[PDB]
């Protein structure tokens, strides 16, 4: 069901031919999500899943791509009868969006591993009858486009996907699952999740994609991993070129995570004449502040990781402090575990390892060490303050004694004379938001940190052992 204009670049014989196809679609009224996802999935299959016989690039012949496209459009058109679901106003109904979601869902293999790589694209849906969680939402949006439902768009948080539709684009619908052993809400709005102030729904400051941002999503969804220790250079290159195409056209302006992904690719292999990784990380953070009320966590995590990899201790700590200053205004809810895992790993593994190395390099005579900078100690404390404030008012606790051992260790990496330099001011100077950290303030400047008292203050524990 492709138009003649869409077929003139085939066969696609290189990365650059795939880029030309994406450029041509992005210059159309609406880019064809089904075409583009089939092409990416095809090239990913033969560059990452099965490279047998590869000599340069897996040539994408029009006959192959058109046949896959026709299997998809046939399946959706045959199963979704639009006359049953009248469309006033160029707006779709909830029943129609649920029907499309049901068609995709009911097409999937009954039993498979949902955490596998390379099951994100419509190539995987057609050839393997397998999709990952977010891949189901994308497929629902692709199918809706194939049906002419111009109002159906992808909605994205930092860990979930759904759709928006309807009068003025204001309706939301769940179309896929989230997590594992979680309870399916397909068909429902996202309003309870927004109202609960969970991270998963971003207090409503989630991405509402247009078709060009949906193209960006598919590009971010490229998975170059061949296995746990090898990536496809071709797919890394393709992703990187496609992200720059999107960037140049303005389609990453409202997509912080994509700017972070691009920055990460530039760190690995910089493109001459382009902005440095740091510039791109800061663009991502600016996009979150401009469009999403500064309510996103990953722009700062992206930044912090870059600094961590480059052993920039000061700037890593600053960026993780900023991560925590975002999370403090959320409630920790039942399906937010991925972000809990992220903060846990930063607090309890990554920061400790960084500080351990800094302690060895200080012993070796390093100058300007983060461990001698009271501003760094203030960032450490702001990080914990944000996590403690996150926990306030939440339906489920965050801190436990497992965190306290690392907090004491990390505090102890700064000498008392450095720690004493931070002035904790009530509403370097630091103001605490959390009641836990306010109560901890006197304990933070002792020469020898009182480990048991810190533990008591950080956790729900209020008594010491009887004997």
């Amino acid at each position: 069901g492709l138009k003649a204009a869409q077929k003139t670049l085939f066969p696609l014989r290189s990365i650059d031919d795939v880029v030309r196809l994406f450029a041509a679609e992005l210059g159309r009224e609406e880019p064809d999500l089904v075409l583009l996802s089939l092409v990416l999935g095809f090239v990913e299959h033969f560059l990452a899943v099965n490279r047998v016989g590869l000599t340069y690039f897996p040539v994408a012949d029009l006959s192959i791509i058109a046949a896959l496209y026709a299997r998809f459009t046939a399946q959706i058109r045959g199963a979704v009868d639009l006359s049953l679901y009248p469309r006033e106003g160029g707006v779709s109904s909830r029943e129609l969006v649920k029907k499309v979601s049901d068609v995709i869902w009911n097409s999937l293999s009954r039993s498979y591993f949902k955490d596998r790589a390379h099951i994100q694209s419509l190539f995987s849906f057609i050839t393997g009858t397998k999709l990952d969680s977010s891949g189901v939402a994308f497929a629902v949006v692709g199918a809706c486009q194939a049906l002419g439902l111009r109002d159906v768009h992808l909605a994205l948080s930092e860990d979930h996907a759904w759709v928006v539709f309807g009068p003025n684009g204001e309706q939301t619908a769940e179309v896929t699952w989230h997590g594992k052993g979680n309870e399916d809400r397909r068909g429902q709005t996202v309003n309870a999740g927004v109202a609960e102030r969970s991270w998963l729904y971003l207090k409503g400051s989630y991405m509402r994609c247009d078709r060009k941002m949906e193209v960006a999503f598919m590009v971010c969804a490229i998975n170059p991993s061949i296995d746990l220790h090898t990536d496809s250079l071709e797919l890394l290159q393709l992703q990187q070129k496609l992200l720059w195409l999107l960037y140049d056209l303005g389609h990453l302006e409202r997509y912080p995570m994509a700017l972070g992904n691009l920055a990460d690719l530039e760190e690995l292999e910089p493109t001459p004449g382009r902005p440095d990784p740091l510039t791109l990380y800061h663009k991502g953070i600016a996009s979150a502040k401009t469009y999403y009320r500064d309510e996103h966590i990953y722009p700062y995590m992206y930044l912090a990781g870059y600094h961590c990899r480059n052993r920039n201790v000061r700037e890593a700590l600053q960026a993780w402090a900023d991560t925590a200053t975002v999370i403090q205004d959320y409630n920790y809810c039942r399906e937010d575990e991925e972000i809990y895992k992220e903060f846990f790993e930063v607090a309890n593994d990554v920061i400790p390892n960084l500080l351990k190395e800094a302690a060895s390099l200080l012993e070796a005579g390093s100058q300007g060490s983060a461990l001698q900078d009271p501003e760094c100690f203030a960032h450490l404390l702001r990080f914990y303050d944000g996590i403690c404030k996150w926990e306030e008012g939440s339906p489920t606790p965050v801190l436990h004694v497992g965190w306290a051992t690392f907090l004491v260790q990390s505090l102890g990496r700064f000498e008392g004379q450095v720690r004493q330099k931070v002035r904790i001011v009530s509403v370097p100077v630091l103001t605490f938001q959390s009641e836990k950290m306010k109560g901890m303030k006197e304990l933070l400047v002792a020469t020898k940190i009182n480990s048991s008292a810190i533990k008591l203050q950080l956790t729900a524990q209020s008594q010491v052992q009887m004997k």
Binding site: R116, D132, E158, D159, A221, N223, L228, M257, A258, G260
Partner: peptide, 12 residues
């Protein structure tokens, strides 16, 4: 074995 991650989530 290669695994899924949410698209453009940072880290490995």
């Amino acid at each position: 074995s290669a695994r899924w991650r949410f698209p453009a989530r940072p880290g490995t």
